[PDB]
From a paper:
Members of the KDM5 (also known as JARID1) sub-family are 2-oxoglutarate (2-OG) and Fe2+-dependent oxygenases acting as histone 3 lysine 4 trimethyl (H3K4me3) demethylases, regulating proliferation, stem cell self-renewal, and differentiation. Members of the KDM5 sub-family of JmjC-KDMs are transcriptional co-repressors, which specifically catalyze the removal of all possible methylation states from lysine 4 of histone H3 (H3K4me3/me2/me1), with highest activity found toward H3K4me3. The KDM5 family and domain architecture is conserved from yeast to humans, displaying a similar pattern with a Jumonji N domain (JmjN), a DNA binding ARID domain (AT-rich interactive domain), a catalytic JmjC, a C5HC2 zinc-finger motif located C-terminally to the JmjC, a PLU-1 motif, as well as one to three methyl-lysine or methyl-arginine binding plant homeodomains (PHDs) denoted PHD-1, PHD-2, and PHD-3. KDM5B plays an important role in stem cell biology by blocking differentiation in embryonic and hematopoietic stem cells (Cellot et al., 2013, Dey et al., 2008).
KDOAM-25 was crystallized in a JmjN-JmjC-linked construct of KDM5B (Johansson et al., 2016). The shift of Y425 creates a cavity which is occupied by a water molecule. The propensity for Y425 to adopt this alternative pose in KDM5B may explain why KDOAM-25 is selective for KDM5 enzymes versus other KDMs that either form different H-bonds to the 4-carboxypyridines (KDM2/3/6/7) or have a less mobile homologous tyrosine (KDM4). The amides KDOAM-25, -28, and -29 were synthesized, and KDOAM-25 was shown to be the most potent of the series with a KDM5B half maximal inhibitory concentration (IC50) of 19 nM and improved selectivity over KDM4C. KDOAM-25 was selective for the KDM5 sub-family with no inhibition below 4.8 μM for any of the other 2-OG oxygenases. As control we used a structurally related inactive compound, KDOAM-32, which is unable to coordinate the catalytic iron in the KDM5 active sites. Structure-based design was used to generate KDOAM-25 without the need for the previously reported ester pro-drugs.
Author numbering: -1 to 0, 26 to 100, 375 to 753
The structure:
């Protein structure tokens, strides 16, 4: 056999009552769906957000993609309109199979994708569209304030919990009250697909959820691995493609690849599949590896998503980043402290969950400060870390974005290390160093206490 399709991931068909609140729904399905990494959600049949777009006025520049298994691709890096892209895309698939596009079976495209990527003699290239929601490339969902009168049907979906523009700013999102420069994680991204255009194996930034909606067009085929098996997958991948695991100079140089799910399955990594059709959602859970390809010309929209369930995994993720020397998108501790400073307006369940994470943060910080004092760092000064651009507050050694504290030395102006890397700053003795801290321990306990009062 060439390709043995992985088993199907779970599919949910919520009632209107179940669907109305996405956070409740996603919490409810977690015990099932976290075991598979991905799941598919079919909205109720009358949930039909209208899509409108001028195919001649929307412009984008897609990336050329070689389709070679295990070959390195960079995670981010010729102008088309949506019309001219669609014409290219349709002609490509039509010519590839010598058939009309709807007649090409999904099973065949999948088999052929996996043949094509493993065959060295084949050098098939396609074009992959990825674009932030913006003035120049709008969301597929309705949004306010475009200097345009919206239809009543459009207005029905402005405030939907499953309008991907709203999910990050709803009260149950833990990023709802955050306002650091992290646009990539509260704003949707648009993906214009064609036959075989592919998303390599990856997990989301900070191990966040993702929500993915296929607005229209031909299906999107997915493979997913549960969070629990993330390190098994990485070990399998490292053995077969070690070049992908060399550390990156920055966060725009991440290496990813196409890899046959049968290889993962041969090494006892659990993998699930689905074909996502127009009008369906795919949800990826924290640290759930996923990859896939498009069956044909299509239009998808996705957003990162951080719930109360995610919060403690977010802390683990930043620890894992420190161990790997990987750059952070934002400071998790900064997020926690921001939320604490708004305790009175938080959702009560969010308040309760932030309180728990904050207690861990404070105890770890207490221990770290005791440790650096014993190393002979004596001098200290308060510092408003949040005011520094990220690249001015990264640990020299592990690249973590500092917030709670860091160590500086006047012999190396502007350099910082986190409290795990006091020995990596410079050759001067520790009495010349200064502990730079955002809060005293006595500042922190009342912040956590406000959260407790809000939580009731
Ligand atoms: C939430 C959107 N986002 C942030 C974008 N930035 C990293 C640039 C992602 O990474 C999503 N992960 C990539 C991806 C693509 C696709 C696709 N082309 O259908 C499906 C699943 N995952
Ligand atoms: Mn090939
Ligand atoms: Mn993704
Ligand atoms: Mn001062
Ligand atoms: Zn460090
Ligand atoms: Zn020094």
């Amino acid at each position: 056999s060439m390709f043995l399709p992985p088993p199907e991931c779970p599919v949910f068909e919520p009632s209107w009552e179940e669907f109305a609140d996405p956070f409740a729904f996603i919490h409810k399905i977690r015990p099932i769906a976290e075991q598979t990494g991905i799941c598919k959600v079919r909205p109720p049949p009358d949930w039909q957000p209208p899509f409108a777009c001028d195919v001649d006025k929307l412009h984008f520049t897609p990336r050329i993609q070689r389709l070679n298994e295990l070959e390195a691709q960079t995670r981010v890096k010729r102008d088309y309109t949506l019309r001219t892209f669609g014409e290219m895309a349709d002609a490509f698939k039509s010519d590839y199979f010598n058939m009309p596009v709807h007649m090409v079976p999904t099973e065949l495209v999948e088999k052929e994708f996996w043949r094509l990527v493993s065959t060295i003699e084949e050098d098939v290239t396609v074009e992959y569209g990825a674009d932030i929601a913006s003035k120049e490339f709008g969301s597929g969902f309705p949004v306010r304030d475009g200097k345009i009168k919206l239809s009543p049907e459009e207005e029905e979906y402005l405030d939907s919990g499953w309008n991907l523009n709203n999910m990050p700013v709803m009260e149950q999102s833990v990023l709802a009250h955050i306002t650091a420069d992290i646009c990539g994680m509260k704003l949707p991204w648009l993906y214009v697909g064609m036959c075989f255009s592919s998303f390599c194996w990856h997990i989301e930034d900070h191990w966040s959820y993702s929500i993915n909606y296929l607005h229209w067009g031909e299906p999107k085929t997915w493979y997913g691995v549960p969070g629990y098996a993330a390190e098994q997958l990485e070990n399998v991948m490292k053995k077969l493609a070690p070049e992908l695991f060399v550390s990156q100079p920055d966060l725009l140089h991440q290496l990813v690849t196409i890899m046959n799910p049968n290889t993962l399955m041969t090494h006892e990594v659990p993998v699930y599949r689905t074909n996502q059709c127009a009008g369906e959602f795919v949800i990826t859970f924290p640290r759930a590896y996923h990859s896939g390809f498009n069956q044909g010309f299509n239009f998808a929209e996705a957003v990162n998503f951080c719930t109360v369930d995610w919060l403690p995994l977010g802390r683990q993720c930043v620890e894992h980043y420190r161990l790997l020397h990987r750059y952070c998108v934002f400071s998790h501790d900064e997020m926690i402290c921001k939320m604490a400073s708004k305790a009175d307006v938080l959702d009560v369940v969010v308040a309760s969950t932030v309180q728990k994470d904050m207690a861990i943060m404070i105890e770890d910080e207490k221990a770290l400060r005791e440790t650096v004092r014993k190393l002979g760092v004596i001098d200290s000064e308060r510092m408003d870390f949040e005011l520094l651009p990220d690249d001015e507050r990264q640990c020299v050694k592990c690249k973590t974005t500092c917030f709670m504290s860091a160590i500086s030395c006047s012999c190396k102006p502007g350099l910082l290390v986190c409290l795990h890397h006091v020995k990596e700053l410079c050759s001067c003795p520790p009495y010349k160093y200064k502990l730079r801290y955002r809060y005293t321990l006595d500042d922190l306990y009342p912040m956590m206490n406000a959260l407790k009062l809000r939580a009731e």
